[PDB]
Structures are given as C-alpha cells and as structure tokens.
Amino acid sequence: SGTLLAFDFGTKSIGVAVGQRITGTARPLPAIKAQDGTPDWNIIERLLKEWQPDEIIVGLPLNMDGTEQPLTARARKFANRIHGRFGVEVKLHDERLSTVGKVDSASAVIILESYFEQGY
C-alpha cells in the first residue's frame, strides 16, 4: 500500500503520524496518552486495523553524538511491544535530536518525513 505509521514515544504522550509513499507525504493524527509510557493498546490496535501500514516507524531518541538518552531504552521497549502484540514490521529510526491534538503529533510527523527523505 505504501501506507506507514510513525510513533514518537513519550512517557505521558506518544505522537502519531500517518504517511503515504505514493504521494510521498506525512500528516499528524491525534496524540495518544500514556501512563508512564504505556498506552491503551486498543487505540494502537484500531490504528493498525484502520490504516493497514506496510510497516511502522518508531523514533529512537539519541544524543547528537549518537549516544543513548534517558528515554532511548523505553522507546525501544515500546517498539518491541508493538511488534510483539501485533506482528506488524516495526522499524526504529534514529532520532538524532539536539538541545536548541494532531499538534501534539508534530514530532511524529517529522520522524516520518525524515524517514521518507532519507530514502527508507
């Protein structure tokens, strides 16, 4: 299909974006609340049945030198649980970021756009 979902892990909120390869674009969906990084999996399940993504992307936050940040490990755990519970291919995409509703998903849109621009 060329349809993809991206998630921006957070402990209180997880951003969501849906993207289309055919048109090469990404757009935000309403963020998902989390309780210490745990969402209401029914929401994630609904998104997967509704969009049938060819694969899903999860941002792997790192430092500008590529070292791991505090959330890196949680982000990864989150990524494995999606894959584990749903079987869809999940891909971690290095989120190299620096210290410088759908609006709460802005970071998920950037993660997905970057993933397309880098040729993945």
Curated annotation (Swiss-Prot):
First-tier enzyme category under EC: hydrolase
GO molecular function term, any single one: 3'-5'-DNA exonuclease activity
Subunit annotation: Monomer.
GO biological process, one term: rRNA 5'-end processing
HAMAP family xref list: Nuclease_YqgF (MF_00651)
PANTHER family per record: POLYNUCLEOTIDYL TRANSFERASE, RIBONUCLEASE H-LIKE SUPERFAMILY PROTEIN (PTHR33317:SF4)
SMART domains: YqgFc
Protein name as it appears in the record: Putative pre-16S rRNA nuclease
Subcellular location per the Swiss-Prot or TrEMBL entry: Cytoplasm
EC number(s) per entry: 3.1.-.-
Function text: Involved in the processing of the 5'-end of pre-16S rRNA during 70S ribosome maturation (processing does not occur on total cellular RNA off the ribosome); may be a nuclease. A temperature-sensitive yqgF mutant no longer grows when Rho or NusA are overproduced, and has reduced transcription of genes encoded downstream of Rho terminators; transcription increases again in the presence of the Rho inhibitor bicylomycin.
Knockout-associated phenotype: Essential, it cannot be disrupted.
